[PDB]
Amino acid sequence: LLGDFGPWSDCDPCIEKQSKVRSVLRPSQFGGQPCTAPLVAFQPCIPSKLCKIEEADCKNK
Partner 1 sequence: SYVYLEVVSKHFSKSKRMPITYDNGFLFIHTDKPVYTPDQSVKVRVYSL
Please say which residue, 6 or 47, places its beta carbon nearer to partner 1.
47
Please say which residue, 3 or 47, places its beta carbon nearer to partner 1.
47
For the segment 1-60, give every residue that binds partner 1 (CB under 8 A).
46-49
The C-alpha angle with vertex 29 and arms to 25 and 30, in degrees rounded to 5, equals 165
d(CA 44, CA 47): 11
Mark out the alpha helices in the chain (DSSP H runs): none
Please say which residue, 13 or 47, places its beta carbon nearer to partner 1.
47
**Interface with partner 1 by CB under 8 A: which residues?**
46-49
